[PDB]
């Protein structure tokens, strides 16, 4: 966390920094999206 | 009377390819578009001042 | 905007398709985004005038 | 050095007085992280392909495969399954 890394979440590839977020996801949701439909927040597997 | 408007700058490769490196490699094949956009925006920016 | 591609995310296009057609999809997205950015620059020039 | 980048951008060996925009300083990534679900059981592909009897075309069979790790090389490496054409995804990337 807090470091510029290139991640891979269930085949969702990208580069950025991962930080703790306070976006109250609903149980059925998996990841959020921004205005331009790029993934903004994500729920990581095997940790929820 | 309006006098000046907002000076704006656009990162061509960041907007058009995001973080994908091979996208930038493909984008290099399209010539000097980003150069012309940067030049035009810089001209507008100095014109405002 | 997909611009007629299978997705609007470059990473998905690259991680899902064989490069011979991935390059076609990326060409579609690149040309669409470049056209939109050209339109923005032209309207900015007119407003600057 | 920064001066040489300015000459390279201007395509000139002499640079006039002023301020020039050259490039961007995008921070490179250092590490690499991959996160996948924590299941380990293999996917039941054997009984689907090695089944003794298939169903009729009008009453085609359907099997639900989930909650398992699927490796497509076990399907790939067998020669007799010749016609393997995939739509919307390359056959090589199925393992990823
Ligand atoms: C995978 O490991 C994490 C870490 O302990 C655990 O929370 C999670 O429940 C595990 N997943 C499964 C399917 O056992």
Curated annotation (Swiss-Prot), chain A:
Effect on the protein of changing residue 36 to D: In strain: Alpha/B.1.1.7
Described purpose of this protein according to its UniProt entry: Attaches the virion to the cell membrane by interacting with host receptor, initiating the infection. The major receptor is host ACE2. When S2/S2' has been cleaved, binding to the receptor triggers direct fusion at the cell membrane. When S2/S2' has not been cleaved, binding to the receptor results in internalization of the virus by endocytosis using host TFRC and GRM2 and leading to fusion of the virion membrane with the host endosomal membrane. Alternatively, may use NRP1/NRP2 and integrin as entry receptors.
Subunit annotation: Binds to host ACE2. RBD also interacts with the N-linked glycan on 'Asn-90' of ACE2. Cleavage of S generates a polybasic C-terminal sequence on S1 that binds to host Neuropilin-1 (NRP1) and Neuropilin-2 (NRP2) receptors. Interacts with host integrin alpha-5/beta-1 (ITGA5:ITGB1) and with ACE2 in complex with integrin alpha-5/beta-1 (ITGA5:ITGB1). May interact via cytoplasmic c-terminus with M protein. May interact (via N-terminus) with host bilirubin and biliverdin, thereby preventing antibody binding to the SARS-CoV-2 spike NTD via an allosteric mechanism.
Name this protein carries in UniProt: Spike protein S1
Organism, as annotated: Severe acute respiratory syndrome coronavirus 2 (2019-nCoV)
Gene designation per UniProt: S
